[PDB]
């Protein structure tokens, strides 16, 4: 846990971004 600002990205982020794009 070096970076205080490090978070996670997964398949669900992808799908929400693609939905957000299509709309």
């Amino acid at each position, epitope marked *: 846990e070096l970076d205080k600002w490090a978070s996670l990205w997964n398949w*669900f982020d992808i*799908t929400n971004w693609l939905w*957000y794009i299509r709309k």
Partner: antibody
Framework: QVQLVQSGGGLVKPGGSLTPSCVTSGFTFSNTWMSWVRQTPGKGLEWVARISRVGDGPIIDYAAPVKGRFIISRDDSRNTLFLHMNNLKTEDTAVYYC???????????????????????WGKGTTVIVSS | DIRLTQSPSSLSASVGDRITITCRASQSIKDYLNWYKHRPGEAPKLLIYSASKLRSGVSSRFSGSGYGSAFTLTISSLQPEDFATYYCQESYSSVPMYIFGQGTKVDLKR
């Protein structure tokens, strides 16, 4: 090495409670959706519940036969998935599997946003016997 | 409210055989279909996701085909470890239900 280490479950009276658990290693637990699936005697595989990352809500869904009696929860700092079983019934007797789930995004444009949800890794199961 | 029908319920096979099992959905589910294996005494395991995508680590002897309502799982050359029960599973419902088929048990022919 990916492992889903499950509790021993055990034996409970109808109306009682139990909390099978699943402690994971080998992958980033906090980035992973999780489910419980059960196998009742004689019958086949039956999905029970799923939970997302804590940051997604969490989003939680339950199968109709357990809605209102079971609670799925997670503790990321310990890599632990729980299934809190309350008001247990003889129909709940089964082997309960924890699973690490994934979603396959649909890349066909008009289905952008939809995904195929599947159980990517499974534990060996915990037996729960509900009997008077 | 989607239904899955697997056939045959029981398949007699020998070591080295080409094996085919089928899953019929009550309606078009496109490619929202996955295949699992379960041997007694082992954790279930994913074989195929999205109708035809092979899971990493699973042998190339497994392959899935189909789009809509008629899906197939094929084992090109049956090995002893393949004697097991195989399930299909759909993920197409709006309210998640994730129905599994009843399973096809593959056993040793005599």
């Amino acid at each position: 090495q990916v492992q889903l280490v499950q509790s021993g479950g055990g034996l409970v009276k109808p109306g009682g409670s139990l909390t099978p658990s699943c402690v994971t290693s080998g992958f980033t637990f906090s980035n992973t959706w999780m489910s419980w699936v059960r196998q009742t005697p004689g019958k086949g595989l039956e999905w029970v519940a799923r939970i997302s990352r804590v940051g997604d809500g969490p989003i939680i869904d339950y199968a109709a036969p357990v809605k209102g009696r079971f609670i799925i929860s997670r503790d990321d700092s310990r890599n632990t998935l729980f299934l809190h079983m309350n008001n247990l019934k003889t129909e709940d007797t089964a082997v309960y599997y924890c699973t690490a789930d994934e979603g396959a995004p649909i890349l066909r444009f008009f289905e952008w946003g939809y995904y195929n949800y599947y159980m990517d890794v499974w534990g060996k199961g915990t037996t729960v016997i509900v009997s008077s | 409210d989607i239904r899955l029908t697997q056939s045959p319920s029981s398949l007699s096979a020998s070591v080295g055989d080409r094996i085919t099992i089928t899953c019929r959905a009550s309606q078009s589910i496109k490619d929202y279909l996955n295949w699992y294996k379960h041997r007694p005494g082992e954790a279930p395991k994913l074989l195929i996701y999205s109708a035809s995508k092979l899971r990493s680590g699973v042998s190339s002897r497994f392959s899935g085909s189909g789009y809509g309502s008629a899906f197939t799982l094929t084992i090109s050359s049956l090995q002893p470890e393949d004697f097991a029960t195989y399930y299909c599973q759909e993920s197409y419902s709006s309210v998640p239900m994730y129905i599994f088929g009843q399973g096809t048990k593959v056993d040793l022919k005599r």
